Paper text:
Glyoxylate is a small and very reactive dicarboxylic acid molecule synthesized by most eukaryotes and prokaryotes. Considered as a toxic intermediate, this compound is metabolized by an unusual enzyme assigned to the D-2-hydroxy-acid dehydrogenase superfamily, glyoxylate reductase/hydroxypyruvate reductase (GRHPR). First, GRHPR is a dual activity enzyme. It catalyzes the reduction of glyoxylate into glycolate, which is either excreted or reconverted into glyoxylate (futile cycle) and the conversion of hydroxypyruvate into D-glycerate, a precursor supplying in the gluconeogenic pathway carbon.
Glyoxylate is located and oriented as D-glycerate in PyaGRHPR structure. Two water molecules, separated by 2.69 Å, replace the single water molecule observed with D-glycerate. Unexpectedly, the catalytic Arg241, which is supposed to orient the substrate molecule, is present in two conformations in the presence of glyoxylate. Additionally, the presence of glyoxylate led to the observation of a shift out the active site by 1.20 Å of Trp138, through a global movement of the protein main chain. A second glyoxylate molecule could be perfectly assigned to the observed electron density and was successfully refined with 50% occupancy. In particular, this tunnel is surrounded by Leu53, Trp138 and Arg241 and is large enough to accommodate a substrate molecule as illustrated by the presence of an additional glyoxylate molecule close to Trp138, providing a view of the substrate pathway.
Author numbering:
A (entry chain A), B (entry chain A): 1 to 334
Write the structure that this text describes.
């Protein structure tokens, strides 16, 4: 008698418990991701879905889900969902902005600093015993990295996470440039940031941070010609999506010294293995953990629940991504 | 006819070249550190020394250096120099403050973030191919770390580097507490920082950063009872000196979950190997590279040269650490 939601992953219990008050809830509890054929089977009679970036919510899913009215992504990105087709069908799509902004902006800085200061390579040198075995405490030319103070940070995608990365950069006294679809004077005045065309941001920055969604417009925007514009001392950080960067071109740039290093949280396929990329000591790698804090987790689970419960009550969900759907079908289950 | 300086390491050429205009210069150029017996031989007829933290400038060095009038440490720390004995003897001692503040404060944040967000462990997971081999792109419970935003940072040693770490923490919207020998209202008002007794800082902080010199008073100040006061979710960062922390107690704290993790740039002996410490995935380790930026390097070399040249000219050196020596012997060579 309650509407039915399938949750494709073991998200925090707080969100599951909130949903159990208002829905019949099914939760995929396994460590492994749900196989595609099982996803298609399980959506047969669901009114709602909570999905991860690992599930491709495309036309084929919709065709196999005739009761589905709302998809809540447990993520701020939604490049895994065919939102135009959802809108067509009157299906509401929600995401999780804001509650993971600080985690991801912190992780961008974690990657920036780790890459700039040789933290991963340094740790291996110590931890392996090589430092002790070689017998040399310190040398003035070892492990030299790059300053941030007074340097220019270039933020590609000046949204929630991009602005939060700029806020952190102000603590390092950085000159802040950004490229975005829009220009925002509030954030400009609060942070001292300045808009420039993309190729100017790439030419003038000491650190380039990617914080855009994946769309047709941002696919491979960091390509071979764009990388050639960057400084040979510059560090690239990708916390956005893997396919914003042409990895083949990035490998060439790193090997040939077109840029100095890269910190990457996201990859063209996940999981990822690339022997050539992974052989480089001027890259730092993390497995798509930008939003991985206990608190962001929990807050994302609450927010997915709030969206689905608002929808049940005939309210517009607070983090609806496809507002055009409202005029197509009003909220609620039938 | 020019005074003679021995430089114990291959510091940047800019500083060497400045000194060659005014001194007969000898530079130890080898990768390895100068052996103790060679140090004692080489100081026999020097008027000045430029030393690294690796050289122990103690009474025995002074007794073997009868012309020595000034020691310029290529470091801000000077726990490797017996400054009281230098003063006694009329020997000026200088260091390198300021020019390495931003490098070291950046590295403190590099270690804080790497430890809080599992950057080293994450990189090994990806780079080794384990992420790919296990076949799972992402899991909501994997690699969960700690937020900074709104959290409390406790700075032990509120000097040049400690205040610069607080400046960076303001970009993360942190509540800033500090313990120091003094209280500083300027920095309090600029950064919103508040003084507290040491044990209160340890109890109330989510991140504890050590930025004190090594002195009799700070030796093993982070001991077993102090570690027990910390939060089980708290992260410790040591960019100060290894002997500020009782490593045996720190290992117990990390294994027993008294604190959540530690980022360490400095060790009780350097180089260092500790199999038990190095087996822990909740530690991040770097080989005393806090000041290792190209620019800090260069600026340290210039500053050592400026000190020795000012002294030659009968001027008080700009970063003299033992001001009492001035009344003992005026500056210059004879
Ligand atoms: N690595 C991780 O763990 C992780 C975690 C969270 C998010 N992410 C990813 O980061 C992305 C951004 O997150 P967010 O919350 O900051 O989203 P957001 O607030 O929508 O910000 C994205 C910004 O990118 C701008 N943008 C979009 N298309 C662009 C284009 N073609 N050219 C230039 N700028 C463009 C957007 O412009 P407009 O102002 O015109 O909107 C917006 O300012 C998500 O979409 C996601 O892919 C990754
Ligand atoms: N890891 C690295 O690569 C690296 C690089 C640079 C420096 N260091 C180390 O970091 C240390 C600090 O550097 P810095 O330039 O910030 O020096 P600093 O300006 O002298 O600051 C040190 C601060 O520690 C405070 N302090 C000293 N003794 C204390 C005590 N017993 N209790 C509480 N606070 C005490 C000092 O108090 P007062 O205000 O009363 O002076 C001062 O505020 C150096 O001495 C060095 O050991 C490490």
């Amino acid at each position: 008698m309650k509407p039915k939601v399938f949750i494709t992953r073991a998200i925090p219990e707080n969100g599951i418990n909130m949903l159990e008050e208002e829905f019949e809830v099914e939760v995929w509890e396994e460590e492994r991701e749900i196989p595609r054929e099982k996803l298609l089977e399980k959506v047969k009679d669901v009114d709602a879905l909570v999905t991860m970036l690992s599930e491709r919510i495309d036309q084929e899913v919709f065709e196999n889900a005739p009761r589905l009215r709302i998809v809540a992504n447990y993520a701020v990105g939604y490049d895994n969902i065919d939102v135009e087709e959802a809108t067509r069908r009157g299906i509401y799509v929600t995401n999780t902005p804001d509650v993971l902004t600080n985690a991801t902006a912190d992780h961008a800085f974690a990657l920036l600093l780790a890459t700039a200061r040789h933290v991963v390579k340094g740790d291996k040198f110590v931890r392996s015993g090589e430092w002790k075995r070689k017998g040399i405490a310190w040398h003035p030319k070892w492990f030299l990295g790059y300053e941030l103070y007074g340097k220019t940070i270039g933020i590609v995608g000046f949204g929630r996470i991009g602005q939060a990365i700029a806020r952190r950069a102000k603590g390092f006294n950085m000159r802040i440039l950004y490229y975005s679809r829009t220009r925002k004077s509030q954030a400009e005045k609060e942070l001292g940031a300045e808009y420039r065309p993309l190729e100017e941001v790439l030419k003038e920055s000491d650190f380039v941070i990617l914080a855009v969604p994946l769309t047709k417009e941002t696919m491979y925007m960091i390509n071979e010609e764009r990388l050639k514009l960057m400084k040979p001392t510059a560090i690239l950080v990708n916390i956005a999506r893997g396919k914003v960067v042409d990895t083949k071109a990035l490998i060439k740039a790193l090997k040939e010294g077109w840029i100095a290093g890269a910190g990457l949280d996201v990859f063209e396929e996940e999981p990822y293995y690339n022997e050539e990329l992974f052989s480089l000591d001027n890259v730092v790698l993390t497995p798509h953990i930008g939003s991985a804090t206990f608190e962001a987790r929990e807050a994302m689970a609450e927010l997915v629940a709030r969206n689905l419960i608002a929808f049940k009550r005939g309210e517009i969900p607070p983090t609806l991504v496809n507002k055009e759907v409202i005029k197509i079908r009003k909220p609620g289950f039938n």
